């Protein structure tokens, strides 16, 4: 009923030309994601989808899962989905998109200096005090309003130390698993929540049962941000009549790449 996307409050505060808000209808839903699907796919190489987990008692359960949007021939920077604070401004060409988007990212990565620069450069424009200042207040306030829900600290910590989601079990060649896990901790509450809901666990631990869903991982985490690289192998293919006639709908099982990472441990009291 109410929009719940970070980019929903994006505005072109010129007082003459309006802005765009192509956030998908799911933007209003309280799915736990805080980015509308349109802006999520456009700004990031992510695709919201649903992962259903069943049991032997015919119990339905679905958990948040994202999807790749990157091809194969792409190398290096393009393979990086969510860059880190030290490697996002370069890859996100802040001076290209509208100032409000830039400020959104700056808050995302704790880039207060860029917020100050955006404000002081905005002061220079004519007609600024008329409505530009009020709109910068509106956009900044709504963005912070999303941030607080995302951030775990806030004022009162509503944190439940139940889900042991450590975001690595990889059996990597180099003994740096404690380092890949050491990361993801510098990310803001928004970043940690977004990466948590985007990637679904491959190994899940509830009570005593050990769950496994993929024989091998999907992506990997580096200090340069969230990067999608299968360990030790080629990149997985991305798609982006008579045989079709003779082959009917047979549970197509589309092969669009799902995300997979991390070890999940769930306590008995957890829900």
């Amino acid at each position: 009923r109410v929009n719940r996307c970070i980019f929903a409050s994006i505005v072109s505060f010129d007082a003459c030309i309006t802005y765009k808000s192509p956030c998908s209808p799911d933007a209003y839903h309280d799915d736990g994601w805080f980015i509308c699907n349109n802006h999520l796919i456009k700004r990031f190489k992510m695709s919201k989808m649903v992962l259903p987990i069943f049991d032997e008692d015919d119990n339905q359960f679905k958990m948040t899962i994202a999807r790749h949007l990157v091809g194969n021939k792409e190398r290096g920077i393009k393979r990086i989905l969510i860059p880190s604070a030290t490697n996002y401004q370069d890859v996100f060409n802040l001076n290209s998109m509208m100032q409000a988007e830039q400020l959104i990212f700056h808050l995302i990565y704790n880039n207060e200096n860029a917020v100050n620069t955006i404000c002081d450069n905005l002061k220079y424009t004519e007609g600024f005090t008329s409505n530009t200042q009020r709109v910068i207040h509106s956009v900044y306030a709504t963005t912070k309003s999303i941030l607080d829900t995302t951030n775990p600290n806030t004022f009162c910590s509503r944190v439940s130390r139940d889900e042991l989601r450590f975001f690595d079990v990889t059996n990597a060649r180099a003994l740096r698993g404690g380092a890949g896990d050491q990361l993801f901790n510098n990310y803001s509450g928004f970043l940690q929540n977004l990466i948590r809901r985007a990637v679904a666990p491959e190994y899940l631990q509830i009570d005593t049962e050990e769950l496994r869903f993929r024989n091998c991982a999907t992506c990997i985490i580096d200090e340069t941000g969230l990067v999608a690289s299968v360990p030790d192998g080629p990149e997985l293919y991305n798609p982006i009549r008579e045989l079709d006639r003779t082959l009917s709908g047979y549970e197509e099982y589309p092969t669009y790449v799902p995300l997979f990472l991390g070890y999940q441990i769930i306590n008995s009291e957890n829900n």
């Binding site: 060649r173 180099a174 030790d232 192998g233 080629p234």
Partner: protein, 188 residues
Amino acid sequence: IVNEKLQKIIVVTDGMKRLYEYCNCKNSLETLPSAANYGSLLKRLNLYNLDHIEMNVNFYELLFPLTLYNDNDNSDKTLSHQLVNYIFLASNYFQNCAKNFNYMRETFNVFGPFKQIDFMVMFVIKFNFLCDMRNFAKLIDELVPNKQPNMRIHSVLVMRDKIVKLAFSNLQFQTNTKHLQRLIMLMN
């Protein structure tokens, strides 16, 4: 005659091992280089130049000799698939080496600033692969010089060589005048 190539590769490997390279061969081909196994090798190499090395690898030429060993008639299917598996393994190992060259360069130069760093890394790759190849040759049973080609094996080798050579090609570089004086004076 192909047997010329057989004996040539055999003797080249034998003599190259004899001269300087001592077999440190326990590790297999399913892995990337490990620093602990090669520190002394790098230290000793530091004083001997390796610029002769060619970045590219003659994958098909390297693996051609072991194509032509087979007892007459279909003695056993095991050799065919064993060779195919070995070929795919070496191909993927080379691909991963080319793909992740920077990390290995850093991991090996952390122990010292050398001027042959990437040269030494490529030498380590080739030497370890050749030791694994020598072990695999010690695995095989017998050969013949009848030189019977195999369309299936050759097709696999050709495709893998194309892929591997292209991947090696994608390797690129980041983008004392008296030497040229001496060169020109030699030319004239």
